[PDB]
Amino acid sequence: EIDYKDIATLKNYITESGKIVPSRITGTRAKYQRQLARAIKRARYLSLLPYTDRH
Amino acid sequence: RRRVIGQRKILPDPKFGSELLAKFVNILMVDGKKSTAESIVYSALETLAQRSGKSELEAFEVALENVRPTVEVKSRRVGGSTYQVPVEVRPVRRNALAMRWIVEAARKRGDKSMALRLANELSDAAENKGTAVKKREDVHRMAEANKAFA
Amino acid sequence: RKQVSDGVAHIHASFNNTIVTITDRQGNALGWATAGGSGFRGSRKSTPFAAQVAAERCADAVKEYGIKNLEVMVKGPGPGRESTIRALNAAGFRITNITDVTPIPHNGCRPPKKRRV
RNA sequence: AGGCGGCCCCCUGGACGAAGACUGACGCUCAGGUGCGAAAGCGUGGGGAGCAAACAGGAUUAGAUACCCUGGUAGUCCACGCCGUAAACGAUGUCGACUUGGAGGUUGUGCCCUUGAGGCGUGGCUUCCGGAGCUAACGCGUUAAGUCGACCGCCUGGGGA
RNA sequence: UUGAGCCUUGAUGUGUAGGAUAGGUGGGAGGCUUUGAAGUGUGGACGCCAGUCUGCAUGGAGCCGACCUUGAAAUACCACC
């Protein structure tokens, strides 16, 4: 919804395990986890974020 | 079930001494005559001390050090699965189990005299030379794999 | 034949076997051990009782390479996935890094739906 | 309806709000029609990781032709063309009005310098709990199986079929 | 770049008791090593834990014999296996 192309911001919401930080932990409303998942998908299909993890 | 009376604490003796020696003169009692074992207790050791150990002071220590059960084996099931399972034995009576395995064989074998039937048994016990122990070990060896469960 | 003293190690633990490898950063396998190597049948091979006795059998597989510092990679769900690592640390080796690399299901083909009982 | 989740670019049905207006009963239903399809199946040519009918083994067992384990073709996918059936199920035909709620979701929107985070309202869609009524009973319960009307589709015991 | 065969070359080699790992073996005082000996072990093989080789830490022309004493037999220099 806002500023989803900034990866220096987005990496505060995704884990070293290759997953997502829960909305319980960021203290955010349920639709922020949807806004975050949409930011992740919109950064993937823009060459801003990787699709997958592992070494 | 869970009760069951509390298991007993046995006794020492004012002449025979320790709780195990006080057990030796009371275990495998048949016909109740109660004067036979007091001529057989610590009386098979002087020849043991020149056959399978040393001194009348260590001849029975080493017998219950060579005969040393550390694991028991028993069936265990959980629904439609059954295993032979190994379990470590509790230490407090461990040497009294080993004692029983010697004094019974002097009764279950009937060869020459009672002045030989125990002394001949003890001289193999002080060396871990019991009957059929290779096939006994073959069960505990097979059950070892079942400490990894299913 | 001088010792290398530094390298990598790879741990795999499935629901049916634990398989441990001492590796090179080029992708070579220098020595290996399997939990079915202890003769155990079925999912026994995934327990610490099996995996904890594969570690020094794997250190024996590199006995002419010479090891000291190791970077570890771990995959798979099997319970043995860390006892095999502590047993290797207790063999006198020092872990430079630990990283988990267990896959997250992607496509996944077909699952049991339709699961055995 | 059956069904349908990605990001990105077109093409497009229907529904819905605010503040108004132009027609003038133009509405409601509907035999037979006229058009749809989930899985599987049929056709012509491709396709083949994973899953797997059939099949061949391992067995297991009294037997195993099956469960369970090892392999595995059809089928699953696509160009399309056919097929028209379902536990197509909240098992409740379509259409309209009247009428206790609570909790909650979802989408417009009227108003107070929104000086607005807040507060006061108000249409659309809809989930769970349930009250008057209905029902044999369970349930339906203002999205009613209620209260009442228009039309259509059906029906009179299993075993046989 | 290497499978296979073959030539070529080095390390060997001791016990026992004593300096001393004398492999065998035929000669034997001035002759030889510089791409080589020492250190003595870190660490690799073998091990009598000494030593030698792979290759260093590393240097870099020497050395060796007498006296002493082992043994069928000698320990520079040089063939042969």
Side-chain angles (χ1 to χ4, degrees), chain C residues 3-109:
Chain C
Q3 297 193 40
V4 188
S5 309
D6 173 64
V8 278
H10 284 52
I11 310 297
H12 193 315
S14 74
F15 296 121
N16 279 358
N17 206 357
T18 314
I19 303 192
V20 299
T21 322
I22 296 169
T23 48
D24 188 70
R25 296 182 183 102
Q26 296 169 112
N28 285 356
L30 306 173
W32 64 259
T34 60
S38 301
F40 309 139
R41 288 167 176 274
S43 295
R44 292 184 180 78
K45 293 176 281 173
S46 304
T47 70
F49 189 85
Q52 194 166 342
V53 298
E56 292 164 271
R57 295 195 300 110
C58 203
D60 197 270
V62 298
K63 59 186 164 282
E64 301 188 319
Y65 202 95
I67 52 160
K68 185 55 52 175
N69 285 338
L70 292 172
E71 290 184 275
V72 183
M73 283 282 170
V74 190
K75 72 171 62 172
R81 76 196 314 287
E82 53 76 52
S83 51
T84 203
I85 307 177
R86 288 184 285 98
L88 190 66
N89 202 128
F93 311 114
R94 303 194 76 82
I95 303 170
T96 314
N97 179 260
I98 304 174
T99 289
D100 206 89
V101 74
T102 308
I104 297 167
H106 288 2
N107 186 264
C109 300

Side-chain angles (χ1 to χ4, degrees), chain B residues 24-56:
Chain B
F24 194 101
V25 300
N26 235 93
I27 200 166
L28 194 50
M29 196 182 305
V30 196
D31 317 300
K33 305 187 181 189
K34 174 52 105 172
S35 71
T36 307
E38 68 179 273
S39 300
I40 303 295
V41 69
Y42 45 65
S43 300
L45 303 185
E46 205 187 268
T47 62
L48 198 293
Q50 58 182 253
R51 188 172 287 143
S52 301
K54 300 182 189 175
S55 84
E56 282 186 289

